[PDB]
Amino acid sequence: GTILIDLSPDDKEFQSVEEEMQSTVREHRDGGHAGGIFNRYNILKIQKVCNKKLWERYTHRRKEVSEENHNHANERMLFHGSPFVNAIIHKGFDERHAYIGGMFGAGIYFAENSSKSNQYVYGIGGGTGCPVHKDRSCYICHRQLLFCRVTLGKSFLQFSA
Amino acid sequence: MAHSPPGHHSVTGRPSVNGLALAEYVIYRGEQAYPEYLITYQIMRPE
Ligand SMILES: O=c1cc(-c2ccc(F)cc2)oc2ccccc12
Ligand SMILES: [Zn+2]
What we know:
Chain B: This is Poly [ADP-ribose] polymerase tankyrase-2. The complex is a heterodimer of chains A (about 160) and B (about 45). Chain A is of the alpha+beta class. Chain A has helices at about 10-25, 50-65, 85-90, 115-120, and strands spanning about 5, 40-50, 75-80, 110, 145-150, 155-160. Chain A has one domain: Phosphoenolpyruvate Carboxykinase, domain 3. Chain B is mainly β. Chain B has no helices and 3 strands. The complex binds 2-(4-fluorophenyl)-4H-chromen-4-one and zinc ion. 2-(4-fluorophenyl)-4H-chromen-4-one (20D) binds near residues 109 and 111 of chain A.
């Protein structure tokens, strides 16, 4: 049920998504070990993910949360990087996409910093890097990230290093 | 998949040491996220 629609670089929507991607790069405490050494990206393509069933699944849950939280879904736009990007865009997020060993328990993790999500594109800790060169800092191979609509509702605040 | 803390729908991981890090978030239901945009990109080597 999923179709992918290419955005033109001239589209204000392409431009605002690219700006969120580029502007939320930071340096990481691993010196680039997991995600590579970089300060910015070369954006090759931005596609809108269209799936009516998955969208209706999201908005149904969003209304449930909102009704439990004084009509406030606390919806954010956040990054997600995963080796399972292809399954996610076709079948939706579920338990198979969870970070079982994550520091806040087994759930599905999202980042404000696109560069944090970039650390997970090739797996936890960057895995063994790109499939072709086995390089976590590969400047050749094409990577994919998701920019996702996320319902937080009432969120438990964890202070952490 | 774990459960959200009782009375909550998600967890926010607030950075407490690295002053430049932004927040990270966890949901425990797949239905609480929709993958709106697929971004294809390369990282760029600093000059
Ligand atoms: O984008 C993320 C993906 C994942 C992720 C982890 C394990 C997987 F198997 C798939 C994705 O972890 C993160 C942790 C913190 C912030 C963002 C992410
Ligand atoms: Zn490569």
